[PDB]
Amino acid sequence: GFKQDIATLRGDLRTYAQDIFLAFLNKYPDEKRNFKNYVGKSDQELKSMAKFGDHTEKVFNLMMEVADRATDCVPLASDASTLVQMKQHSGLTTGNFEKLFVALVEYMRASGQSFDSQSWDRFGKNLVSALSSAGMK
Ligand code: HEM
Numbered sequence: 001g002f003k004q005d006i007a008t009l010r011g012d013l014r015t016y017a018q019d020i021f022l023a024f025l026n027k028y029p030d031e032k033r034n035f036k037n038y039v040g041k042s043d044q045e046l047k048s049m050a051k052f053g054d055h056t057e058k059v060f061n062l063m064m065e066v067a068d069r070a071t072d073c074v075p076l077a078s079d080a081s082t083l084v085q086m087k088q089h090s091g092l093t094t095g096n097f098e099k100l101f102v103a104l105v106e107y108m109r110a111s112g113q114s115f116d117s118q119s120w121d122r123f124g125k126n127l128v129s130a131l132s133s134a135g136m137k
């Protein structure tokens, strides 16, 4: 289930984080307007850029902490308010988080692995709800 999936992702996190984030940026190319430094690069080129690998791993590091702290795929209000208050997320709306979790769930659904895609879908919707409640537009 969901807990085992957090372990599975953590056991190869650099690779999972990079491949899921690339799936997000390729499914939703407009979302690069938040990452202007990633424009005009192929997947292989991005995976060569120090900040791509480091930023994406840190994102997933914190996403897995938030998922691990969740009950029944519902994140702590403390984690939702951290994600809202982050200066790095100044620009963002829940739609930005929605698209990332659509890409993550589609990635899990395409993988040959027994990922609980249903639970990640719930987690993505419940994090969007918690982000709105904590004052993200
Ligand atoms: C659960 C979902 C997410 C988590 C846990 C998360 C976490 C983080 C973290 C930890 C950083 C700091 C990275 C660093 O400085 O090395 C960061 C930066 C950032 N995040 Fe997020 N993030 C999430 C979703 C999103 C989404 C959906 C967007 C935009 C569509 C976004 C846009 C950014 C931007 C623009 C930065 C700063 C520039 C960059 O890191 O490349 N985040 N995020």
Ligand SMILES: Oc1c(Cl)c(Cl)c(Cl)c(Cl)c1Cl
Binding pocket: 017, 018, 021, 035, 051, 052, 053, 054, 055, 056, 057, 059, 060
């Ligand atoms: O560079 C980044 C990567 Cl790889 C990911 Cl996955 C995310 Cl969510 C963000 Cl915000 C940045 Cl800046």
